[PDB]
Design a protein around this nucleic acid. Structure first.
Lengths: 98, 99
DNA sequence: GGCCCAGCCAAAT
DNA sequence: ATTTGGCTGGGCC
């Protein structure tokens, strides 16, 4: 998948660490800030600067937002797909448009 | 019931001029710095800080995002518009209903 | 009423 | 003709 491969490539660069990174477990990823992501990082990896079109694409590939009851950030967004993991770089094509 | 009046009230505040305000013609409103808007202004007036929800409510009330085309307020600006929602029509807010 | 996720068309490919 | 971006809507809670 084109989008998925690019999502994983994004999460390789540590310069982004404080803004968008893998979670501690490595089984989900966290968008910690929004503005610098939306303005600086989204454009460089995807064809938009619109956080919500990013979100929309995630739901199309069956990623789900993980709901907090605070753990990562006040206004952080965490997304998780069962197959999308830091250690499973091989299994990316298994993630596909619902 | 409450949304439209509060939205109108929000736009009565000039201190927010750089962030969110009425459009030149007073017939639509524009969010210019949605980070600042989202994190400072939204909670004040609607008690959440998620732009997506603000957008969702807007569509529920039949507001529409006004797609700009080359020739606005910045490309990261979001302009929203309802025929009956206007700077000079504080009297008409009841006719803006959940579609 | 906030919010996740999806419908549906257009804008790109 | 097919894919990707984005405005809008459905429905849980």
């Amino acid at each position: 998948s084109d989008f998925v491969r690019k999502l994983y490539k994004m999460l390789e660069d540590p310069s982004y660490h404080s803004v968008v990174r893998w979670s501690d477990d490595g089984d989900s990823f966290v968008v910690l800030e929004n503005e610098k992501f939306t303005k600086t990082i989204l454009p460089k990896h995807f064809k938009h600067s619109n956080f919500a079109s990013f979100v929309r694409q995630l739901n199309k590939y069956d990623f789900h937002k993980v709901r907090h009851n605070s753990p990562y950030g006040r206004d952080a967004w965490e997304f998780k797909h069962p197959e999308f993991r830091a250690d499973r770089k091989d299994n990316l094509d298994n993630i596909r448009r619902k």
